[PDB]
Design a protein around this ligand. Structure first.
Ligand SMILES: *[C@@H]1O[C@H](CO)[C@@H](O[C@@H]2O[C@H](CO)[C@@H](O)[C@H](O)[C@H]2NC(C)=O)[C@H](O[C@@H]2O[C@@H](C)[C@@H](O)[C@@H](O)[C@@H]2O)[C@H]1NC(C)=O
Ligand SMILES: *[C@@H]1O[C@H](CO)[C@@H](O[C@@H]2O[C@H](CO)[C@@H](O)[C@H](O)[C@H]2NC(C)=O)[C@H](O[C@@H]2O[C@@H](C)[C@@H](O)[C@@H](O)[C@@H]2O)[C@H]1NC(C)=O
Ligand SMILES: *[C@@H]1O[C@H](CO)[C@@H](O[C@@H]2O[C@H](CO)[C@@H](O)[C@H](O)[C@H]2NC(C)=O)[C@H](O[C@@H]2O[C@@H](C)[C@@H](O)[C@@H](O)[C@@H]2O)[C@H]1NC(C)=O
Ligand SMILES: *[C@@H]1O[C@H](CO)[C@@H](O[C@H]2O[C@H](CO)[C@@H](O)[C@H](O)[C@H]2NC(C)=O)[C@H](O[C@@H]2O[C@@H](C)[C@@H](O)[C@@H](O)[C@@H]2O)[C@H]1NC(C)=O
Ligand SMILES: OC[C@H]1O[C@H](O[C@H]2[C@@H](O)[C@@H](CO)O[C@@H](O[C@H]3[C@H](O)[C@@H](O)[C@@H](O)O[C@@H]3CO)[C@@H]2O)[C@H](O)[C@@H](O)[C@H]1O
Ligand SMILES: OC[C@H]1O[C@H](O[C@H]2[C@@H](O)[C@@H](CO)O[C@@H](O[C@H]3[C@H](O)[C@@H](O)[C@@H](O)O[C@@H]3CO)[C@@H]2O)[C@H](O)[C@@H](O)[C@H]1O
Ligand code: CA
Ligand code: CA
Ligand code: MN
Ligand code: MN
Lengths: 237, 237
């Protein structure tokens, strides 16, 4: 069939969402993935938002795979330039009913203990041992070690428009990152076989994380706000 | 092996540009692919601009194929809404030393009498018998009958930002079309093996065309201006 939803803004206690950990909805409508107290982002924070109902990316009966397009706007404000903001946010697809994973450079989607598959598009702002310079957009498959990455300069506190598109017939997952205020455009694409790494039904959502305590740096933090979000998927048959 | 060039604007008879047919450079720096007399675009016009030097997309010795990224800004002003603007502009890669081809729906890159391979990204503004709804972005390979197309709404006379990127390792050619004034974003991608369709050395450039006389409609016209252009290619070879 063909599912599709769309939030032009968020309402406190959104029946259509599942907030986890530090994820909250501010009074003025934005989805704050990581904690921010009195206008200031704190470290040691991790949160995710999933769409309440599961979506079917493929049908084992027909063998068909769904194509999808999702658009969202986010904003990352980095109050403390030194020594290094962290960690970033990601959009991900995962099995339904998963639980927040490790924080820090794992964005809360990777769980070393009990690893579950996931396809995610990351917006990394802190350089871990496995990362190339930052910030960078990355395409992750079952691992936080991106298959493809591309650098980008962040518009601190500005608005970012993202477009993620998946064409099943070509298996191409292409993402676009635009900062309207700077007129800058960033693009990245890679081949991904959803049918090969994910179950027929999945959850889609966001996950973010601020500096991990082990880094011993309270400054290692930033905001991870989601302003709007629309999703559309087509599974012929 | 990295080649690259940037034009933040164009100047009267530039050293590194080969203008063909109606293509000219206005006194105020824009590259006008098709004819415009006294601020008005005319029909029966065709013009191309090629980068003076040839670029190497692949080496037959190593078998390696180059990856590349090119960005440009164009503007299409359609003064006459009825009966229909035509025909559009394209960015293309082709064997070196080619001559302008047929105009009209062929954008000046296809020559029925002496065909030559070419890879192109088109912004089609007229609907020929082989065309789907217009306007649309299309990826063409040796034919003006796109392998993949996506519709888009034009910002009449507005500025358009384009980003074309080719990743050799995945063979993915992804293009992004942004209209900053409307904040709209369009994206399309397909698999293309340059090594399979083009020679080692090629020319890169633009080509446009206005209504063909056979259409018997002088209003079938519009402008095809290129404001800026940057190109970068990397051959590991
Ligand atoms: C953590 O972020 C703090 C807020 O930006 C930094 O402190 C600020 O540092 C400025 C110069 O870097 C200085 O002008 C400000 O007065 C100060 N703001 C306040 C009132 O705290 C801090 O920078 C360093 O550490 C602080 C404690 C001071 O020693 C500064 O002189 C240092 O530059 C950031 N900590 C770091 C860099 O690890
Ligand atoms: C469409 O444009 C062509 C050139 O861009 C015209 O052909 C050229 O016309 C010139 C003026 O008539 C002539 O000096 C050139 O030799 C000739 N060269 C070419 C490319 O064929 C073409 O047709 C001409 O113009 C029309 C108006 C008639 O006068 C014909 O006899 C000419 O061939 C133009 N077609 C039309 C219908 O405008
Ligand atoms: C060819 O383009 C012309 C310029 O836009 C069209 O004329 C304009 O038509 C408008 C309504 O279509 C009218 O409000 C404008 O005043 C007029 N502008 C001028 C000075 O021509 C033209 O439209 C046709 O021809 C005109 C003279 C009228 O009879 C209209 O009813 C016709 O549609 C366009 N011709 C076409 C569509 O083939
Ligand atoms: C990072 O954030 C944690 C919140 O999830 C803090 O611990 C809290 O959660 C633990 C379970 O992991 C609970 O047992 C505690 O009640 C919570 N502690 C607090 C903040 O009230 C965590 O705090 C540190 O670690 C916990 C286990 C306690 O020892 C705290 O005193 C200690 O500060 C926090 N880490 C840091 C470095 O702040
Ligand atoms: O600043 C926040 C970041 O914290 C972690 O990043 C690593 C670095 O901060 C690194 C510094 O050398 O330290 C790592 O952990 C330490 C242990 O704490 C220490 O006991 C010893 O084992 O060495 C290691 C490695 O040096 C931190 O993991 C997060 O992983 C990162 O995402 C940021 O949030
Ligand atoms: O008006 C601009 C467009 O002109 C051509 O488009 C074709 C169509 O307009 C088509 C009508 O359906 O007519 C074609 O030409 C006619 C000949 O004039 C006629 O003698 C006979 O051969 O039939 C054909 C139609 O097949 C036009 O070519 C351009 O092709 C298009 O790109 C626009 O520029
Ligand atoms: Ca990281
Ligand atoms: Ca056409
Ligand atoms: Mn990364
Ligand atoms: Mn077309």
């Amino acid at each position: 069939k063909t599912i599709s939803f769309n939030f032009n803004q968020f309402h406190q206690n959104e029946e259509q969402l599942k907030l986890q950990r530090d994820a909250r909805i501010s009074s003025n409508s934005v989805l704050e993935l990581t904690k921010v107290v009195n206008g200031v982002p704190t470290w040691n924070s991790t949160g995710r938002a999933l769409y309440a109902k599961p979506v079917q990316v493929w049908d084992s009966t027909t063998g068909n795979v769904a194509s999808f397009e999702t658009r969202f706007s986010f904003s990352i404000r980095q109050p403390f330039p030194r020594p290094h903001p962290a960690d970033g946010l990601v959009f991900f697809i995962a099995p339904p009913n998963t639980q927040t994973g490790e924080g820090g450079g794992y964005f809360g989607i990777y769980n070393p203990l009990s690893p579950y598959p996931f396809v995610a598009v990351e917006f990394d702002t802190f350089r871990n041992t496995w990362d190339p310079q930052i910030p960078h957009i990355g395409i992750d498959v079952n691992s936080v070690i991106s298959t493809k990455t591309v650098p980008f300069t962040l518009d601190n506190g500005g608005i970012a428009n993202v477009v993620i598109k998946y064409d099943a017939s070509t298996k191409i997952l292409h993402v676009v990152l635009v900062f309207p205020s700077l007129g800058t455009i960033y693009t990245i694409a890679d081949i991904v076989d959803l049918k090969q790494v994910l179950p027929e039904s999945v959850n889609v959502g966001f996950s973010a994380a601020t500096g991990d305590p082990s880094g011993k740096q309270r400054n290692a933090t930033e905001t991870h706000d989601i302003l709007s979000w629309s999703f559309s998927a087509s599974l012929p048959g």
